[PDB]
Structure formats: structure tokens, C-alpha cells
Design a protein around this nucleic acid. Structure first.
Ligand SMILES: COc1cc2c(cc1Cc1cccc(Cl)c1F)c(=O)c(C(=O)O)cn2[C@H](CO)C(C)C
Ligand SMILES: COc1cc2c(cc1Cc1cccc(Cl)c1F)c(=O)c(C(=O)O)cn2[C@H](CO)C(C)C
Ligand SMILES: [Mg+2]
Ligand SMILES: [Mg+2]
Ligand SMILES: [Mg+2]
Ligand SMILES: [Mg+2]
Ligand SMILES: [Mg+2]
Ligand SMILES: [Mg+2]
Ligand SMILES: [N+]
Ligand SMILES: [N+]
Ligand SMILES: [Zn+2]
Ligand SMILES: [Zn+2]
Lengths: 365, 163, 365, 163
DNA sequence: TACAAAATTCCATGACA
DNA sequence: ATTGTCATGGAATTTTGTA
DNA sequence: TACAAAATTCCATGACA
DNA sequence: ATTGTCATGGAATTTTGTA
């Protein structure tokens, strides 16, 4: 219908006059700068697009270029984009081209024992029949306990933490979501002691960074001690623990041990500045050192970042994606924006999931 | 001369033989001279070997400048001597039979015994599991003098489990 | 010797007068802003450093801070740095903090068949008993051949390339150093045809980027075709090949097929602009299109890059580093700097190795 | 009307039965109408099935607008018809017995036969392996008219193996 | 009231699989 | 409901010892 | 001879294990 | 002797249709 009057020379919103709209083979044609193109009827158009796109599932420009060979009509890209937004396959397969916003730098825990971060390293080469190391970093001081285990398992973790929590009980233990800690046995152990468990977002180690960064120090120091020799880490663990707790951070200008104790034990090169002050005068200088520690601010956002908006179509990264399968889940919607980097989504389907944005892409179109 | 500080002296002693708990028989007692902080370690025998295993554990956290003890066969041993010489710890022994230690330490070293007995009656088989709860309890008891907990003197903060 | 006259108040190059240098316990001491420090004799000093450093194998500042507790002397950091340069263990274990210089963007091959890049994808899920795909990208056009194989093996590769090289023989075949191509059987096949073999630097896929980037397109298109269905890639390969060769690059504004043939086959949405020109007029417009293609320039260097200098101590990344072992080889020296990103080193020991700088760190100190 | 171009017509034919080589018996012959470019495919039988397998191979590279052939049982089959209809290829048949094709194509379609025989005498068992070398040879022969190789007409460049 | 060189602080880079 | 971190060694900056 | 909106070009982001 | 690449979709820029 809307193509009869055009041949008759009448104006139709969107079709520039000055180009002559003739007829050949019973198809409406137009003579354009780029060439002679067929204008298909409105009803035919969505079909045409889908076909162009389906040749290789190409994005906006690549699809348009195909279509432009044979056809013209007004606002072509509009119909293309519309179609791409509805292609299940591309939505779940294509990568992001938008990076997540700047990371946050959570405030340092205020007092020691406010927060422990924990994690397992390994499997390592069998040393004395032990394969894994439980690592416990105090959040405030960076002080670290090491425990060797036979498996990254709740029972092992409890055994070690029972020893540890003789010195003191923490307010909060932060861990990743590995079977060891997500177990109901662990929750129960913690609830017995009034220790709050808190979990990183799934598949996101940045959140456990205070521990994970310490695993690297451990693994690097052990390695160095083992050059030449057979990998016999078991007997070294204590030495590494002591070594590390007593190492200066060039930025803080203190060792974990210092920040925990306000005075050095009887180790090599023990600092002697406070030797003249009563323990009391020592303990309050320490009180003050701890508050005035360096603290990083968040970096600037990259030119093409994105932030989660409540109610935004969003997709979550597939966990352990099989070979040849899509790298993304179907779309889901943002429910609460907890901070600019953590989000609650209604997923597949429909459970509440607390996820990191690094594991999300904003569904496009 | 210089004021008393944590890690200056560690007073160590053995307690037991106790009823067998998880196949353990003795407790090694380690109280910090200055703070009264206490560490307990379960052992199978009051031997040098057991002491060393236990103290290796403790000395991943902190090394005392001096360990004081009675002239028990386990401490006067030459292995134990070389052990401490390795770590640069000076060994200090009370004369035999007149075994003095700090006034605060005795106060403490006495509490433990009382506490352990109150526990050992009625539950003599299970004392291994309760050691941590016992420790937390001693370390967070108010001193009648100073009126700081050992916990407070060591860490310069309030504890999350107060008594 | 050089410590007697200092107590006697005489000047010694490097020891600032205005600080009093007294004696206690038979150790020379000085009263400094920071505190009272022991000055050890020259002969004792290297020992002292080594000991500080050996506690945890700490770098410059972290080692210095330890030493500064007890001791002072002039130019402390100088002796520290000297020691760190000689610590075998740290040299081979520590990471880099210097990134390699900007990548190069090699000139696009001039004519088709000047250069093929080849590579194997997989293993994939068994489809018709086939597990691997041989991918052949023509360098100039981007035109791509796909061949399914049972193993990423010379024999397979030869079989497929015998079929391919019926159309035309390339000047140069570029590949990675995987067993398939580094085999003497392959060299011999190539020498039979006057095809020059050329190899990427070991453990560096950027060099095969023209292929590797195409593997991604293949894997992504196959994936999309397989949503819902069982992974039956065998029958799809041809369709993907055709699909891909006929897809526009939004930057070039051409399909591989176009750049190879200068005219579209009988596919969907085939371009018809040249329909009026003789084949000759077509073939020379093509000649000209090919020369005038877009070509990227190299990006700017990051503030902290490094370039290889002939004769520079340099270390090569360990291949398949075992658990707990050093991530770096012992030091080796640069022999020729081939371009600012490829280097010839004398290694372990001593063979000539042509390596990429991404797989090198400049030995520090 | 519009000048002759590659992919406008593909002239296909069968050659054989030949002596068995690697258990193959026929060659499918595919010459491009415009350029004289030739593809050879070894088959086990002059059947629709074999044709389709071969042409599936060729049509990952390029799809002709028209395939021309004689009325051989394999091409006049209804499967083959649906095959071409799928790909939007138009089928074109010579009348039976008077099988015309382009003058240039005959010139070419004749060379191959000559070339294959020169090869088949003395080496009748090994012809499968030499097909690529044969192909490269036909595609890089100078046309006596135009004086461009088929290779040159298809790719608009000189070949790396010239004859 | 000003210099060269040492001491210190800055900070991108990379690794916790 | 939760959140990246920090040793390392050149380079950039600030301080020091002396005038 | 200057406008809004469409068409095009720019280009950071990420993935080839 | 060897060397990164390029589809993708918002955003930035340029062109278009009309006055
Ligand atoms: C990026 O790939 C990783 C996945 C990791 C981990 C580490 C890395 C690399 C990495 C490591 C440490 C810190 C940071 Cl900042 C970092 F980037 C763990 O360390 C870990 C654990 O169980 O402790 C579990 N995962 C699992 C997958 O098996 C998931 C959490 C993805
Ligand atoms: C980074 O880890 C990789 C190692 C790869 C590959 C790919 C990647 C990821 C990556 C892939 C493709 C392109 C780019 Cl630029 C890229 F960064 C191969 O693709 C490949 C092959 O045999 O083809 C062999 N390797 C091996 C290790 O098994 C070595 C060459 C390291
Ligand atoms: Mg873990
Ligand atoms: Mg970890
Ligand atoms: Mg005793
Ligand atoms: Mg490969
Ligand atoms: Mg690859
Ligand atoms: Mg026939
Ligand atoms: N925070
Ligand atoms: N080049
Ligand atoms: Zn799609
Ligand atoms: Zn070292």
C-alpha cells in the first residue's frame, strides 16, 4: 500500500524526494549515489534483516553492509539493531566491549581480629603426606597464620582454626565460596563462637585480595627457599610464617608483627626505638600508628566503563563453560545495586544472586 | 633500667600426668612475664622432644628473649640447650627446690591449675577440646592490679570475647 | 683500621662530622636523628646485608629497613643493591616490574599467497571421530580454509595442505612451534614445493595473531550455530568457512572473498557494483583496492617499558614451570636485536635462541 | 548484456573409469566458464552422491550462478536438482548427443584429457597423488588468446609457480 | 641561600589459578 | 548480603651536609 | 548558509589457551 | 632467523536533506 503513491511522486515521511523511484521486475527501485537499490515493502523488511544477520550472526555494521548491497529503505540501521537485540544466540555468545567501573578499596579493618580473610593454596607436591596450606590473614595487621592440610576441607579448616582461635576470636571471617567454607558444618562452628561468616561474590578472587595477595608472597618465598633442593615445604612453613610476619611493607613502614604487637619479638634486626617507653606509652603510640596508616583511593574509570542501574538488563558469565558452548547466561535483571561493583540479580530462574560486575555484561540493544 | 615488655621472658612449665584425652597426657604452660598471656600446649610426655615440637609452634608467632623454667630433666637437657642457642633465646633456671618466678606469674600459674581441676572433675576425658576455651578465659581475665586483661596488654585492644 | 681516627675526631670521606662517634661495648656508635646506631667495620658489612636480606629475600627498601634498625654506615643502599644483584634465588624468582615496548604491526602481506598463517584448534568434542581443525588464513586477504583432523599432526597437516595447494602455492607458510610443524617431515614437504617455512618465537601467539584471531571467529560462529543442539561441528565446518570468507570487516569494508576474487560468488546478498565493468577493469580496481587498505600503526609505549640493547643481561621465562619452582631461567645475554621486540640470546648453555621480549625480563641491578 | 565474469558458469564433467589409484576411479572436472580455472575431484563412481560430496567441497570457496553439464544420469537426477535448488544454483543441460560448451572450455576440457593420458601411461596406479600438480599446471598455462593464465584471471596476480 | 648527591617516596607492573 | 592487594626497583622528588 | 538527525567512522574491550 | 589481530556497539564526528 505505502509504496503506490511513491511511484506516483507523492511525499512519504522518510523517503527523500530528488531521487527517482521507478519500477522494474515488479520491484520498487531507487537510484542512489551508491547505486541502484531495491526498496522492499515494510512487511518484507524484518525477514530480510534476519537473513542477512543469520549468514554469520554479524553485528551492526557488518550486517548492514550485506543488506546495503541489494536493498535500501529509510533508517536501515534502526531495524538492524532491533533484530540484534532479539538474537538469542548473539546475546549469549558475543563478548563485552564495555569494562566494569573502577574497583573499590574497602576501608582497612580497624582493629586486629575484626576480620580474618582465609583461603587454601594447592594442591602442592606431597610433602610429609600434606597437600594443601590453609592461610589466614588478619585484615588489619596483615599478620598471617599458616596450617598444612591433607585436603581443602571443612574438617581440616575447623581443626586448624580451633588452634588459631585460642589466641583470640575474630568478629568476622571472610572467605571465597569453595566447598570448605560454604558447608553447613562450618556455618555451625562459626555460630557457636559468634563469628560472622561473610562470602566473596562467586568466581571473583579480588574480593579475597588481602589473602590472595598473601598467597603469592608465601608461594614466592617458599619457592626461593627450595631452589636446588627437593620440594619439602612442610618443615619450611613455620619459617616462612615468621619470616613474612616480620617483613616490612615499604609503604606502611611496619611489619605485620609490629602492627599486631607494637614491639618486635626476639628476632634478627629487631627494632629498638620504643625501648625507653613504658608498655602503656608504647600501646598508645601503636593505637595511633594503626589509625594513620596509608590507604589507597580508587583509580579513575576507563573511558568506556559501565555502572549497574537498578532494573537494567544484565548477563552473568557462565561458570565452567563447556567447549563450544556460550560464554554467557541468558539475560537477567538487576534488583539492588549494593555498591557500584556488587549487584543482586534475578537469574535462571529466578533466584537471587549476589554477583560482582566483573562477572556481568550489560546486555546491549 | 628499661621497662618490662612482652617477649622479654617466657615462663614455661609442665602439668600432668592428667587423665588421657585424645591420647594426650600433659600440658606445657607458657606465660609471658610482662603481660601474663598464656599459651597451653598438649603433649604426650614431659620430654625435650615434646617441648621442642610445642615451642616450635609458639615461636612462629614470637620469640622470647629469655625462657625461664625449673630444672626439670626436659629443660636442662643439652638438645633443648642447642635448640635455644639456635634461636638466640637465653635459658634461665630457678635453683632446684626453691623455684621462684614473678609474683604476677605465680598468681597466673596458679589460676590455671585451679581452672583445670574445676574442668577435670566431671569431664576428665575431654580436656583436650576445652584448652582453647580455657586459654581465651585466662587471657581475658581482669588482672586485680593494672586492670587490663593479658589480651589487652599484648594487642592494645579490647577483645571480642570478654569475661 | 679506618674506624680508629673517627673516634679521634678526624674526617673520613663519607662520615658526616657534627654527629658524635662514641664507643660502647667495643662497638663504634653514632647518635643519629633516627636514633643510636652501631657502625660496623667495612669487612663485616657485606655479611650483615646478606643476613638481613636472607630473612625473607626482600627487595631494596624492605631489606634496608631491617638493617637500619641496628646499624648505620655510609651509602647503605649501595651495598644492599650490590647484594640483591648477586642473589641467585631472587633473580630467578621475582617478577618483572617493567613492561615490554609497544608491539609492532607487521606490514600486511602484499599479494594473496605471499603468506599463509596456520594453526590447529582443539581438542574439540568428538564429531564423526574428528577432534581438531586445521585453520589456514591467507595473510593478505584473510581468506580462510578449514580442515578437520583426528590429530594435530604432521601427516594430517600435509594431507590437508596437499588439497589446498592445488589452488595455488604460497611463498611462505607461517606457523607456531607445535610438533606438527617443527617436524623434519614437514620441512621436507615444504622444501619440495619451494615454500619457505617461518616460525613464531616460542610460546608467543601474538606472532600468529592473524590466525589466532581467526580461530576466535570460527569458534564463536560454530558456538552460535550449536546453541540448543548437540556439538556436531563436522558438518558445519564448510558452512562456517563460506560464512566467514564472505563476512565484511567493518574497517576494510570488504570480505576476504572480495579481496581474493574481486567479485562475489553466487551467495546471499552478493555485491553487484562491478557488474558493468569488464573483468579487466575489475581486476585492476581490485589491484588498487588491495594496496590502499587500512593499516594500523603501533601504539604508544607505556611509561615504564624497556627495550633490548645488544649485550644486556636478560632472562627468559620458564616454559612449563613446575609447582613451587622459579618462574625464570638464569641470566643470559642479548646477541642481536632483530627488531625492537624480537631478540637473539645466548642461553642455558649456550644455545642461540630467538625469543620475544614478552618472554624476557631485563635482569635488574 | 553484462560482460562475462568468474562464477557465472561452472562446466562439470566426469572422466573415467581410470585404473584404480588409492581406490579411486573417476575424476570430476570443474572448469570456470570465464577464467578457465579448473578444479579436479577424485571420486569412486560417476554418481549423484559422489558429485554432491565433491561439489560441497568446491562450494565452500565459491558458488557458481550456473552449472552446465551433459545429460549424464548423475546430473539429471532429482537429488542433484534439489541440491542445486538449495544453493540457488541454476542447472543447465546440453541437448543429448550434441553436447556443446564454450569454445575456450573445450580447448581446456581437451588439454586435461591429453595431460591425464600422458600421465596415465607409465604411472597408471599413482594418478591420485599427482592431481594437485596437474591442476597447478592447467591453471598456470598461458591461454593462446588473452595471454593470461586462469590463475591470473581469477586472482588478478602472478602465480608463485609459473609454467 | 644554593648546590650535587644521597635518601626517600612515587608508582606502574604483575601474580595470588 | 558486599567490596582487590601490595613487593618491587627505576625514576621523580625531597632532604641533607656543607658553604 | 545553518540546522537536527541519520550515516559513518572512531576506537577501547576482549579472546584466539 | 622475526614481528599481534580485528568484530563489536556506544560515542564522536561527519554528512545529508531541506531551507
Ligand atoms: C583469575 O583466575 C583465578 C581463579 C581463582 C583463584 C585465583 C585466580 C587468579 C587470581 C588469584 C588470586 C587473586 C586474584 Cl586477585 C586473581 F586474579 C583463586 O585463588 C581461587 C581460590 O579458591 O582461592 C579460586 N579461583 C577460582 C577458579 O578456580 C574462581 C574464584 C575464579
Ligand atoms: C596466552 O595463552 C595462550 C597460549 C597458547 C595459545 C593461545 C593462548 C591465548 C592466546 C591465544 C591466541 C592468540 C593470542 Cl594472541 C593469545 F594470547 C595458542 O593459541 C596456541 C596454539 O598452539 O595455537 C598455543 N599456546 C601455547 C600454550 O599451550 C603457547 C604458544 C603459550
Ligand atoms: Mg580458595
Ligand atoms: Mg587462592
Ligand atoms: Mg616441671
Ligand atoms: Mg597451534
Ligand atoms: Mg591456537
Ligand atoms: Mg558425463
Ligand atoms: N568499607
Ligand atoms: N614488515
Ligand atoms: Zn545472531
Ligand atoms: Zn634473595
Amino acid at each position: 500500500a505505502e509504496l503506490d503513491q511513491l511511484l506516483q511522486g507523492h511525499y512519504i515521511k522518510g523517503y527523500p524526494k530528488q531521487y527517482t523511484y521507478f519500477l522494474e521486475d515488479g520491484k520498487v527501485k531507487v537510484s542512489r549515489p551508491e547505486g541502484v537499490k531495491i526498496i522492499p515493502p515494510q512487511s518484507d523488511r524484518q525477514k530480510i534483516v534476519l537473513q542477512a544477520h543469520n549468514l554469520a550472526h554479524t553485528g551492526r555494521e557488518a550486517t548492514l553492509l550485506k543488506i546495503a548491497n541489494l536493498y535500501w529503505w529509510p533508517n536501515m540501521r534502526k531495524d538492524v539493531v532491533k533484530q540484534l537485540g532479539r538474537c538469542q544466540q548473539c546475546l549469549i555468545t558475543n563478548a563485552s566491549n564495555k569494562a566494569s567501573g573502577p574497583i573499590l578499596r574497602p576501608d582497612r579493618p580497624q582493629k586486629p581480629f575484626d576480620k580474618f580473610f582465609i583461603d587454601y593454596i594447592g594442591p602442592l607436591p606431597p610433602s610429609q603426606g600434606y597437600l594443601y596450606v590453609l592461610v589466614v590473614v588478619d585484615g588489619m595487621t596483615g599478620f598471617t597464620w599458616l596450617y598444612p592440610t591433607k585436603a581443602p576441607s571443612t574438617s581440616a579448616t575447623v581443626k586448624s582454626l580451633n588452634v588459631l582461635t585460642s589466641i583470640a576470636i575474630p568478629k568476622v571471617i571472610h572467605s571465597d565460596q569453595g566447598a570448605a567454607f560454604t558447608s553447613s558444618t562450618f556455618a555451625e562452628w562459626a555460630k557457636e563462637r559468634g563469628i560472622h561468616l561473610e562470602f566473596s561474590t562467586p568466581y571473583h578472587p579480588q574480593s579475597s585480595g588481602k589473602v590472595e595477595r598473601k598467597n603469592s608472597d608465601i608461594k614466592r618465598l617458599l619457592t626461593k627457599l627450595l631452589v636446588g633442593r627437593p620440594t619439602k615445604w612442610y618443615d619450611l612453613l613455620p619459617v616462612v610464617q615468621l619470616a613474612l610476619n616480620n617483613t616490612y611493607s615499604p609503604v606502611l613502614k611496619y611489619t605485620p608483627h609490629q602492627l599486631l604487637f607494637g614491639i618486635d619479638s626476639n628476632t634478627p634486626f629487631a627494632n629498638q626505638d620504643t625501648l625507653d617507653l613504658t608498655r602503656e606509652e608504647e600501646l598508645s603510640l601503636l593505637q595511633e600508628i594503626r589509625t594513620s596508616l596509608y590507604h589507597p583511593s580508587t583509580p579513575p574509570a576507563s573511558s568506556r566503563s559501565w555502572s549497574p542501574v537498578v532494573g537494567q538488563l544484565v548477563q552473568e558469565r557462565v561458570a565452567r563453560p563447556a567447549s563450544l558452548r556460550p560464554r554467557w547466561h541468558k539475560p537477567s535483571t538487576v534488583l539492588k545495586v549494593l555498591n557500584p561493583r556488587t549487584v543482586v540479580i534475578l537469574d535462571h530462574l529466578g533466584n537471587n544472586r549476589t554477583v560482582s560486575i566483573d562477572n556481568l555484561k550489560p546486555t546491549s540493544h | 633500667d628499661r621497662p618490662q615488655k612482652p617477649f622479654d621472658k617466657f615462663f614455661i612449665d609442665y602439668i600432668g600426668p592428667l587423665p588421657p584425652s585424645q591420647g594426650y597426657l600433659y600440658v606445657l604452660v607458657v606465660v609471658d612475664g610482662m603481660t601474663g598471656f598464656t599459651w597451653l600446649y598438649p603433649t604426650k610426655a614431659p620430654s625435650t622432644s615434646a617441648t621442642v615440637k610445642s615451642l616450635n609452634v609458639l615461636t612462629s608467632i614470637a620469640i622470647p628473649k629469655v625462657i625461664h623454667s625449673d630444672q626439670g630433666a626436659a629443660f636442662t637437657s643439652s638438645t633443648f640447650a642447642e635448640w635455644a642457642k639456635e634461636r638466640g633465646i637465653h635459658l634461665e633456671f630457678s635453683t632446684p627446690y626453691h623455684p621462684q618466678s614473678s609474683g604476677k606469674v605465680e598468681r597466673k600459674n596458679s589460676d590455671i591449675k585451679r581452672l583445670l581441676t574445676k574442668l577435670l572433675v566431671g569431664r576428665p576425658t575431654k580436656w583436650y577440646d576445652l584448652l582453647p576455651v580455657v586459654q581465651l578465659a585466662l587471657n581475658n581475665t581482669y588482672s586485680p592490679v593494672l586492670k587490663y586483661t593479658p589480651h589487652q596488654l599484648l594487642f592494645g585492644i579490647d577483645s571480642n570475647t570478654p569475661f
